[PDB]
Write a protein that binds this ligand. Sequence first.
Ligand SMILES: O=S([O-])[O-]
Ligand SMILES: O=S([O-])[O-]
Ligand SMILES: O=S([O-])[O-]
Ligand SMILES: O=S([O-])[O-]
Ligand SMILES: O=S([O-])[O-]
Ligand SMILES: O=S([O-])[O-]
Ligand SMILES: O=S([O-])[O-]
Ligand SMILES: O=S([O-])[O-]
Ligand SMILES: O=S([O-])[O-]
Ligand SMILES: O=S([O-])[O-]
Ligand code: NA
Ligand code: NA
Ligand code: NA
Ligand code: NA
Lengths: 254, 254, 254, 254
Amino acid sequence: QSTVDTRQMPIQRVGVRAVRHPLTVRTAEGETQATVGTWNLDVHLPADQKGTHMSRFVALLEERGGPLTADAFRTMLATMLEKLEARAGRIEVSFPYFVNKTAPVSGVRSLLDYEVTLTGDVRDGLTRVFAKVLVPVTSLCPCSKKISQYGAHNQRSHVTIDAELAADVPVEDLIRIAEEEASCELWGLLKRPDEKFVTERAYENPKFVEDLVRDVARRLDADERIVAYVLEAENFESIHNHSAYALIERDKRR
Amino acid sequence: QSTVDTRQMPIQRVGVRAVRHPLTVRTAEGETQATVGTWNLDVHLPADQKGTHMSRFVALLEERGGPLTADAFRTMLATMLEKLEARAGRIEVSFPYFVNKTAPVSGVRSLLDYEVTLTGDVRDGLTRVFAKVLVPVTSLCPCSKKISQYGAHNQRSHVTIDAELAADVPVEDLIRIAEEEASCELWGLLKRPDEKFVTERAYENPKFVEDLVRDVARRLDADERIVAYVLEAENFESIHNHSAYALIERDKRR
Amino acid sequence: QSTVDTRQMPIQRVGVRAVRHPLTVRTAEGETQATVGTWNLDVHLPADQKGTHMSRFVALLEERGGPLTADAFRTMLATMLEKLEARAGRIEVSFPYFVNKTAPVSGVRSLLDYEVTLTGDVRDGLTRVFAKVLVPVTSLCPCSKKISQYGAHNQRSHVTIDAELAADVPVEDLIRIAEEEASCELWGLLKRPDEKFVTERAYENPKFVEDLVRDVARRLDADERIVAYVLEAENFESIHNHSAYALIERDKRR
Amino acid sequence: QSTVDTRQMPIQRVGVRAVRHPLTVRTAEGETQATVGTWNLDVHLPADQKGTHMSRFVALLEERGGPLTADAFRTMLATMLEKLEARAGRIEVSFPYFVNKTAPVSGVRSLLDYEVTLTGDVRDGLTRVFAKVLVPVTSLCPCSKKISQYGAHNQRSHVTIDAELAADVPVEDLIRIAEEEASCELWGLLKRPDEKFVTERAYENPKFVEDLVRDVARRLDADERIVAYVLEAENFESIHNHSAYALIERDKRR
Ligand SMILES: O=S([O-])[O-]
Ligand SMILES: O=S([O-])[O-]
Ligand SMILES: O=S([O-])[O-]
Ligand SMILES: O=S([O-])[O-]
Ligand SMILES: O=S([O-])[O-]
Ligand SMILES: O=S([O-])[O-]
Ligand SMILES: O=S([O-])[O-]
Ligand SMILES: O=S([O-])[O-]
Ligand SMILES: O=S([O-])[O-]
Ligand SMILES: O=S([O-])[O-]
Ligand code: NA
Ligand code: NA
Ligand code: NA
Ligand code: NA
């Protein structure tokens, strides 16, 4: 339980990685969605302690019950520190999140999948909560449209908003900013009139990666509920075998 | 070596998987191209033989020298069967492959990467060789262009040609067929005149995934060198979070 | 809607790939488990038809309701052929599947995740249903144990049973054969006495990949409910950076 | 070039991502090793500049020639900033790296593959260079061995050393530190005497993930060349479907 002097050094994170467990989450309409999560749970290990208890992190996942409300997630972080007899720990869980969506012209309903990561960290007595969402959208190239007699190259794009939250934000709030700022958002089901609509909206609203990151960042900068964010936009170029990438990091405290 | 009756059954494939190993390949331009390969080497195991020798498959990779050519690959398949004391075996290697390309208007030269898989199988008295290439290309939707006042949804597409070879075929020949049948091919480096060119040609040549596979299949059908093939085209839809997909399978001997 | 003569050729499969949709499944205890699936839905396209309707495949997923019982899956395949106006189609869905498990000595309960793929194909008037499960287990090397004064090298292994089913088989039935034939099965939560138990059981039951595939195959050969299977075992070697792979394919009809 | 006030904000990172390109690296043994790299090239964008030139980043890759050495990598970072007309930028390349290795007893020679990431960042008037290597090793559980009558659960482990360099360090030096501190290192080709050797040494040298990271950290702390580092060790538990994980982060300037 105690370290040799050559091993007398603290470990910032020690725990389980990639544990797959089912979870239930709460929508902005208060409804519960069943999803599967990949969990990472770790604690700080004091220089003197030889090792953590790995079994306890799995035990905590089995014990937990109910929707993963922002309140339960904070409770889980505190439960882990008590179960593991630790003073500092991180819990991270990623899962696919589905929003029912209405086609722009037809009104036909379809689910779209977003990748959501929720991270809680307790270090220096300070509890920090982060919500990260990957939103798939459509991007059209302004240069292609300007220099071409007809057509404009467009590609699927991923906008990743990772935000430290001062207060509760629904993920739908983060998804909405990316979808509104995108040349055009994505629907799973589109009838012919909808395809006409999204083809035309994207062309009318071309955006480089730089344009998209700046437009999304300005909206994030205005939401007080967000204290700090890392914003990434990746355009999977249709005319190339690589991607165009823009990153903006903001810490309002600083 | 020796099996119990309960374990007295032949194993069609036994050996090593995912062995990463450097390899040099003689190109159509006669350059020796150095690339990294993931190797799968396996042999049929007779009911009475309890196990193959795993170390020998790795030893063959270390022993082998010089550029990989169609003749060298066949020689390796025979060498392995002799080394492993086996009558039937399969060798599969997948590696990134690069072709220097010339931009359509400016003529600027850039590398484009393809995924090549070379597979040799000896079984039932027959030696079969297969060349599989994943070709990245551009696809433009004919419906989007027809129904829209402006624009046409376009996206990166992968054309996978998996061909059993009656006669040796350079990978470049398979890549060329896919690139020619695509709405537009892909270049790593495009100048603004090139960007204008590829935007326009894609628009002038819209193809559905069904149109793309059918056009590639017709070229494969006309090729005396290819006895049989499994052809796949996937369109990574810009307007959707999923892909459009088509597969044509054909055996000339049928 | 009709093909040019150069494009007058049938396409075996045309449809959507990698569509992520939530689904509910039924356990062998008849209970319902909520899981997320990646769906692939395609139909055969007659030479004359220019193209399928891609929107309909997504519409079918949105329309479907209730647990995905083996009876619903057959109904869905028929519904798709009618919705898409086709005569032949394939529906494939993969999802993580969780079984609550009891530790061997402590009796502590933990969930384990398996990858389950369910595939339905309707071609030549014939309906075929396939259930594929990836089961994670533990493998110990017989050679290492025999030649070493102490210790024996052991690694996580994946056993993949893909089976065409004459009649309904619960996935738990397929998982059980792999877990019983493995040097030792896997538990998410293990107390110290359980770790002693699984350390010792694995050592007492060493199995090469060949031994494991043959032991599992014999059990599959005995289950009439299975008409044909592809069995794969991969050992992720702890002493190497590659894997040991064994494959057995059986078609009882043949 | 020119921004609106709403888009008047700096972008910390803008450029190309996931560009695949061949590269040659001079090895510690002075051999020129040809490998395939995935490149990420980005530059800081000033608030007033509306966009970077994407084509130039690809042009630099095509233009660059000769083996990648520490000096050459620094020269490329400067070349890119001049080519892109930028004052701050990052270049990151990841490639498979092979070291010929000698078996512990038989002395047979086999290649072992590592994942190398070289990152150069110029920002805030400071140029920072980092070498990151993923080293595959073997880990044996000390608890399994102590509590069991026979055997000890062991598994492949990845040790990732991400080091900021005060002075140039060959990747081989980082790999050696991880291999020496591991229960046992990995060889591609092992003869039966070698198998006996590595089985026994691992058993005689059991390490927990906390023990492994602490031992590697002590070597890194003693190294004058490394100013700072993020050290990760992941044990892909044979007895579990998840991984044990530990991370130590250290900045000497702190
Ligand atoms: O590595 S664990 O068992 O503290
Ligand atoms: O499987 S989760 O990453 O969507
Ligand atoms: O997990 S996100 O907060 O980096
Ligand atoms: O799996 S055995 O034959 O090394
Ligand atoms: O191995 S490829 O030819 O399917
Ligand atoms: O729209 S489809 O038929 O490629
Ligand atoms: O995400 S499913 O493949 O487990
Ligand atoms: O999807 S399985 O049946 O090959
Ligand atoms: O090409 S743009 O994204 O500067
Ligand atoms: O880029 S690596 O040094 O984190
Ligand atoms: Na463009
Ligand atoms: Na379309
Ligand atoms: Na072994
Ligand atoms: Na253990």
